[PDB]
Design a protein around this ligand. Structure first.
Ligand SMILES: *[C@@H]1O[C@H](CO[C@@H]2O[C@@H](C)[C@@H](O)[C@@H](O)[C@@H]2O)[C@@H](O[C@@H]2O[C@H](CO)[C@@H](O[C@@H]3O[C@H](CO[C@H]4O[C@H](CO)[C@@H](O)[C@H](O)[C@@H]4O)[C@@H](O)[C@H](O[C@H]4O[C@H](CO)[C@@H](O)[C@H](O)[C@@H]4O)[C@@H]3O)[C@H](O)[C@H]2NC(C)=O)[C@H](O)[C@H]1NC(C)=O
Ligand SMILES: *[C@@H]1O[C@H](CO[C@@H]2O[C@@H](C)[C@@H](O)[C@@H](O)[C@@H]2O)[C@@H](O[C@@H]2O[C@H](CO)[C@@H](O[C@@H]3O[C@H](CO[C@H]4O[C@H](CO)[C@@H](O)[C@H](O)[C@@H]4O)[C@@H](O)[C@H](O[C@H]4O[C@H](CO)[C@@H](O)[C@H](O)[C@@H]4O)[C@@H]3O)[C@H](O)[C@H]2NC(C)=O)[C@H](O)[C@H]1NC(C)=O
Ligand code: MAN
Ligand code: MAN
Ligand code: MAN
Ligand code: MAN
Ligand code: CA
Ligand code: CA
Ligand code: CA
Ligand code: CA
Ligand code: CA
Ligand code: CA
Ligand code: CA
Ligand code: CA
Ligand code: CA
Ligand code: CA
Ligand code: CA
Ligand code: CA
Ligand code: CA
Ligand code: CA
Ligand code: CA
Ligand code: CA
Ligand code: CA
Ligand code: CA
Lengths: 423, 429
């Protein structure tokens, strides 16, 4: 059985092989001997010159069409002679050239990767296809040099290579949500054959994970407000930051566990805006400061609460007037009671603090009495000169206590004293 | 004028508070004359003043927690006076706090949810205990059952306020333990001060439950990276190839697995096989033709339904088993149209060949020439045959003999094919 070879894409009339010579048949006897092609093995790709016995290319051979991706390509032609009957088989092997580049199934590839993918995780890609065979078939892949992905190609026999993306370093959607690289595939064509290349754009969409915690610029905020600040007064507009996407980045504010029930009464916090406002009466006299404990938390899965603390210092106002309290009053005074005779003792108080709780007091009128002070917050009503009126006539003394605030506040109180007869 | 006394809270009626007469220099014989009396404004149900001796005794028992709450200072202000001459005296009575109250938690049972992906060092605020006593008798410290996952952090903010928080010491794993239970205790500072009998330390308690919230931190896992299955060709569609089993100990959608074809699979495998998304059941959906290909590579990925799901991959190697599903094919290349009557034994009459697309015995072919004819079969090569003469032909002149050949393969059941040609005998000088 005879063996010949022929390249694909040879033009009409190309020599394939000399059957007459290779079979020991002299050309002068071929016509007599009935040299002819067997009916079954006729092929439009080969012409057999019967008077010379030479096999030439007739119609051009495209190996990709007759043999597709078969690793072997053989046209089977049969010739025969008569008297005596002799049959000869002729195999014509079609050799592959590299007239096709590798090609990708999709021009644009998009692959979605969670930003929490671990380095070393692999992401499969549809391999490119090259219709040539052997060394002219697919050889290797390459990707744009980058810091995030490398390429892994592996062959498991059967002349095939498969590639998958290898994550090199963690991704962060909050810094870059889309990567675009160029992916290329080359065959092994190296008369001399040249290497061909195919290309596809590659888009990596980084999928969000709830990997960012809400964040306050500082752990403690200090705010100062005047007492009696009306409810609804703005305490502070908190702002937590969470660069995540969707529910992962939406922040809701709430009170922490530590908050006193008193502060929970005195303050209101709107969950979504972070607006901390007054909702009760701030009484400096009750307490000069309050500690508000807040937590913020996003609405995604695995959310981690963040915490901050608002220090609310109350500023004292003058909202308490002095209180006078008389401890004793002498029923009556002797008419000839010499100067300095005590008539009554009393005290003053002011629920405020600092200037607002410091009080100056005065006795009103043009009366023969003066005010003396033995102790702190203690006063005495004394005589100053002899007495205008005697015996039955009574006096009514009124004292005014006034604090040192702005505006100032004052209170008054009266007592009835009378002149009797000296015993 | 001004006097200072001290008294323990919770002293019984009649306890001595102070001798006002002595401390003021007043003789008791003149007290009745001088009008020794308490100022109306400063009367208090907590103190009785014996006017003929000038001694202050406890009257109604004092509970410091009630009158002064948590003030660091507690002072009852009493006023007394004498007449002729009018003299007023101020008396401050300091109530000292004892440790007659334990720390207490607002709720006996506390529940806190913590993501298993919480970072070690993260702190979780805890509902603080309250001690109504003041100073050293108030809240001092918190303690938790010793463990490896959580420690306690205390922070003092002044004004008798103390904050406790759980500190995550090491990562949590819901798949291994979803709930931790600890005992939480809070103690004040009565262990060691103005003449008070030594105080003992009191303690309060609350149970602590840590519920670990699930995170999608487990990837589906195949017990093997490659599975190999052998099946006979033409196994009917729906035939079971393999039942995959992805493992994902997570909870909910994090633990619900869906299966799919990987991107590398040849489209031929996608046509010939069907994979059920939820169960992982891989079955045949087309005709498996060994002669087309003896093996197929199915590349699968499994992936859960939670956020940030990470795909896992496996590879199924399906080896096809050859059956006898191809009958031999006979092909005559050339046949002598006529053979002379006077043909001696051995004259060749025909040539042909046989093929069988099967393999091994299923592709092994034996040949037979049918009938009781004067011809015989010869073989120069394997699967190549010649039809020759054997003896003198019974027929002569015009009659043409017709010959049928039967090719039979060696499978079970075996398969065979036939082909015949008729050639005429010619006459020779
Ligand atoms: C809660 O906090 C939010 C975040 O706080 C940030 O974090 C800290 C650490 C600082 O960096 C601070 O500066 C940040 O604000 C806060 O968010 C946003 O803060 C920005 C400023 O960064 C505010 O200003 C405006 O930002 C927009 C962004 O628009 C787009 O364009 C850029 C660039 O193309 C993109 O990168 C973005 O992704 C956006 O898609 C600007 O367009 C805008 O420009 C205008 O202002 C300047 C000022 O001179 C003018 O000259 C220009 O002509 C424009 O008129 C500002 O730069 C922004 O308002 C604010 N919101 C958002 C949604 O960004 C947020 O305000 C805080 N919340 C509350 C209630 O306070
Ligand atoms: C994929 O493989 C799964 C393998 O399961 C485990 O995975 C790892 C850890 C390997 O070590 C493997 O060996 C393990 O078995 C397979 O999971 C199968 O799940 C079922 C359902 O739970 C198991 O059946 C029974 O489990 C219970 C305990 O489960 C409790 O919870 C469920 C649901 O909440 C309740 O329904 C139960 O009532 C329980 O409350 C066992 O109590 C029970 O014991 C019986 O079986 C043993 C077998 O020897 C007998 O000795 C006993 O007498 C009982 O008759 C069952 O075991 C099942 O065990 C488990 N796997 C296997 C192999 O049994 C899953 O099915 C696979 N998926 C697919 C699609 O194939
Ligand atoms: C295909 O094209 C690339 C350049 O894009 C070459 O490097 C390669 O050798 C082949 O010619
Ligand atoms: C596909 O296209 C790219 C363009 O970047 C070439 O570099 C490559 O050789 C192929 O032609
Ligand atoms: C209360 O109880 C605790 C133990 O739970 C002690 O440590 C403490 O001293 C007080 O007795
Ligand atoms: C609360 O209960 C616990 C029980 O574990 C004690 O140890 C503690 O002293 C307090 O009585
Ligand atoms: Ca071609
Ligand atoms: Ca080619
Ligand atoms: Ca090629
Ligand atoms: Ca991130
Ligand atoms: Ca994110
Ligand atoms: Ca977030
Ligand atoms: Ca006030
Ligand atoms: Ca005030
Ligand atoms: Ca005032
Ligand atoms: Ca008490
Ligand atoms: Ca007490
Ligand atoms: Ca206590
Ligand atoms: Ca886990
Ligand atoms: Ca989990
Ligand atoms: Ca999972
Ligand atoms: Ca078959
Ligand atoms: Ca077969
Ligand atoms: Ca067969």
């Amino acid at each position: 059985q005879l063996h010949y070879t022929v390249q694909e894409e040879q033009e009409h009339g190309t020599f394939v092989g000399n059957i007459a010579e290779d079979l020991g048949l002299d050309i002068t006897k071929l016509s007599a001997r009935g040299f002819q092609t067997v009916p079954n093995s006729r092929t439009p790709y080969l012409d057999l010159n019967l008077e010379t016995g030479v096999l030439y290319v007739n119609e051009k051979i495209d190996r990709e069409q007759i043999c597709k991706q078969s690793p072997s390509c053989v046209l089977h032609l049969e010739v025969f002679l008569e008297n005596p009957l002799e049959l000869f088989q002729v195999e014509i092997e079609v050799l592959d050239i590299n007239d096709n580049p590798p090609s990708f199934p999709e021009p644009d590839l998009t692959v979605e990767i969670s930003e929490s993918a671990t380095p070393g995780t692999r992401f499969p890609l549809e391999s490119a296809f090259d219709p040539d065979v052997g060394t002219n078939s697919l050889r290797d892949y390459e990707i744009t040099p980058n810091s995030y992905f490398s390429l892994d190609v592996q062959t498991q026999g059967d002349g095939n290579r498969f590639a998958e993306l290898v994550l090199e370093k963690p991704l962060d959607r909050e810094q870059q949500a889309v990567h675009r690289y160029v992916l290329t595939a080359v065959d092994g064509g190296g008369p001399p054959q040249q290497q061909r290349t195919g290309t596809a754009l590659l888009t990596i969409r980084v999928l969000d994970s709830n990997d960012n915690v809400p964040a306050f610029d500082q752990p403690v905020y200090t705010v100062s407000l005047p007492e009696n600040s009306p409810p609804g007064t703005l305490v502070i507009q908190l702002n937590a930051t969470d660069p995540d996407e969707g529910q992962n980045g939406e922040v809701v504010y709430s009170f922490s566990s530590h908050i006193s029930p008193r502060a929970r009464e005195l303050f209101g916090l709107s969950p979504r805006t972070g607006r901390l406002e007054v909702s009760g009466e701030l009484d400096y006299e009750e307490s000069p400061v309050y500690q508000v404990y807040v937590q913020a938390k996003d609405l995604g899965p695995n959310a981690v609460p963040a915490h901050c603390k608002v220090l609310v210092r109350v500023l004292d106002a003058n909202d308490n007037a002095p209180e006078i309290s008389f401890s004793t009053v002498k029923e009556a005074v002797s008419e000839g009671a010499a100067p300095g005779t005590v008539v009554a003792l009393f005290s003053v108080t002011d629920r405020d603090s600092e200037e607002n709780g410091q009080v100056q007091c005065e006795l009103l009128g043009d009366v023969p009495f003066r005010l003396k002070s033995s102790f702190k917050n203690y006063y005495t009503i004394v005589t100053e000169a002899p007495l205008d009126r005697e015996a039955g006539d009574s006096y009514t003394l009124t004292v005014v206590a006034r604090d040192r605030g702005e505006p100032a506040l004052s209170t008054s109180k009266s007592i009835q004293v009378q002149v009797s007869d000296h015993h």
